[PDB]
């Protein structure tokens, strides 16, 4: 039953990797809007 628990933990890791991909696209959007902020300020 330990292998099933490890598989469930790997599924949780996959879900968190999906959240990390969401974080990465959020980060690229943040970089784009930071460039926009710097362009509109200067």
């Amino acid at each position: 039953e330990i292998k099933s628990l490890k598989h469930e933990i790997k599924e949780l890791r996959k879900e968190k990797n999906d959240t990390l991909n969401n974080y990465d696209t959020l980060e690229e959007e943040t970089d784009d809007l930071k460039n926009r902020l710097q362009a509109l300020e200067k």
Partner: peptide, 7 residues
């Protein structure tokens, strides 16, 4: 950004 597009 909105501020920089509000003024």
């Amino acid at each position: 950004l909105q501020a920089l597009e509000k003024e």
